[PDB]
Amino acid sequence: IVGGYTCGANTVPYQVSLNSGYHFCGGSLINSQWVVSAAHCYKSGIQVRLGEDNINVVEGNEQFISASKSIVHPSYNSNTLNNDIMLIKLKSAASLNSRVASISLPTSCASAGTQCLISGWGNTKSSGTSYPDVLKCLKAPILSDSSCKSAYPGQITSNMFCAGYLEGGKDSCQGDSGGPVVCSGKLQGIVSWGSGCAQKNKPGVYTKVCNYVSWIKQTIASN
């Protein structure tokens, strides 16, 4: 996250860290046994870490659970990153508590102008590399699709939306992928891609979760 602030320990209780010997992507807990993340974060041998704040120090509120199965969306295109979403089933159910809670799926899609909260353990520099150890947060609005499509011609589909600051300065970055975008108490996006981080006229691009609630609900009930 570039231009964000330190969230505070366990203030984003639905945020998860996917680890394969190191933190490589974020995710969101949707219920005791399922996590949603981006499909481009797919890897075999994932350990989901919940109740995390400093990912390098065990502070006591963490739960490390291995994934029993991963489902990448049937229409995921790794070239355009259209349908960038995947579900992960935990080997055991997580114990939900004050520090570990799930996020609710949306009943409708959000409007341009709505403010959201984006969080993650990714790079914090637009031009440089600085990876933090504690969770960072950033508040950003959803941008009109017109401004999104004008920043990226021919690349935006109906399953994506942009959020951020066209002036640059604030944005999600790599290491934040798969993580949540929550607006009004519902999970509306997943960190997917963008052009660099916090560059002018290059806002972040997110997976539009309101278009996948039926596939999500149907898939977790059958697995």
> Residues annotated as binding site?
52, 54, 57, 62, 171-172, 174-175, 177
Q: Which residue is nearest to Na ion (CB)?
A: 179
Considering the complex, state which of residue 26 and residue 164 has its C-beta at the smaller distance from Na ion.
Answer: 26
- Under the rule (CB under 5 A), what is the footprint of Na ion? 26, 120, 176, 179
Of 37, 40, 73, 119, the active-site residue reads 40
Q: What stretch of H or E contains 162?
A: strand 160-163
Tell me the residue type at 196: G
Q: Which of residues 163-222 bind Ca ion (CB under 5 A)?
A: none
CB of 15 to Ca ion, least distance (A): 12
| Rounded CA separation 97/91 (Å) | 18
Q: Which of residues 38-57 bind Ca ion (CB under 5 A)?
A: 52
**Residue numbers belonging to the annotated binding site for Ca(2+):** 52, 54, 57, 62
Choose the contact partner of 179 out of Ca ion, Na ion, none; CB within 5 to 8 A by kind: Na ion
Of 84, 102, 176, 192, the active-site residue reads 84
Residue 133 annotated among the catalytic residues of the structure: no
CA separation (Å) from 140 to 119, 149, 163? 11, 18, 6
Q: Which of residues 56-75 bind Ca ion (CB under 5 A)?
A: 58
Residue 184 annotated among the catalytic residues of the structure: no
Per-position b or e across 141-157, b if 16+ CB within 10 A of its CB: bbbeeeebeebbeeebe
CB of 57 to Ca ion, least distance (A): 5
Query: Could you give phi then psi for residue 221, rounded to 5 degrees?
Result: -80, -25
Considering the complex, state which of residue 58 and residue 93 has its C-beta at the smaller distance from Ca ion.
Answer: 58
- What token pair was written down for 83? 């349908």
Choose the contact partner of 176 out of Ca ion, Na ion, none; CB within 5 to 8 A by kind: Na ion
| CA atoms lying within 13 Å on the CB side of residue 222 | 7
Residue 84 annotated among the catalytic residues of the structure: yes
Considering the complex, state which of residue 67 and residue 135 has its C-beta at the smaller distance from Ca ion.
Answer: 135
Which among 223, 189, 210 has a CA at the least distance from the CA of 90? 223
Choose the contact partner of 175 out of Na ion, Ca ion, none; CB within 5 to 8 A by kind: none
CA separation (Å) from 62 to 11, 27, 72? 14, 15, 26
Task: Using the structure block, give the residue that is written with the tokens 């231009």.
Answer: 3
Return the active site residues. 40, 84, 177
What is the contact surface with Ca ion in residues (CB under 5 A)?
52, 58
